[PDB]
């Protein structure tokens, strides 16, 4: 099956439900973690602990189809190069939510 359906289930996003949307980043972990010291921007929710990558990154967007329902979740796969925006927290100060891509 398509990348979204397969990886959604493999990663335990869709073994127990169907998630409307999820994004996967094809960069090294350390290059994603590096975003938490890049450009500070507001989060969608207005908190201020979000960070936008300087560079675009390889990303796959997965979004449920209109008819998709558990257990037979169904996704549309869209691949793109886009900047990512992550929320960071902690010591070490690392990504804890994927806010958006642009």
């Amino acid at each position: 099956s398509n990348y979204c359906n397969q990886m959604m289930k493999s990663r335990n996003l869709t073994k127990d439900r169907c998630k409307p949307v999820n994004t996967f980043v094809h960069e090294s972990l350390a290059d994603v973690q590096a975003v938490c010291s890049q450009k500070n921007v507001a989060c969608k929710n207005g908190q201020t602990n979000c960070y936008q990558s300087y560079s675009t990154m390889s990303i796959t967007d997965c979004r449920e189809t209109g008819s998709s329902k558990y257990p037979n979740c169904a996704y549309k796969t869209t691949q793109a190069n886009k900047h990512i925006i992550v929320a960071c927290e902690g010591n070490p100060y690392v990504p804890v939510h994927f806010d958006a891509s642009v």
């Binding site: 980043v25 960069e27 902690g90 804890v96 939510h97």
Partner: peptide, 15 residues
């Protein structure tokens, strides 16, 4: 308990 950092990785990283 899975931490928030590990959650993000499992959901969003595919290097």
């Amino acid at each position: 308990k899975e931490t928030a950092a590990a959650x993000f990785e499992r959901x969003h990283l595919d290097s």
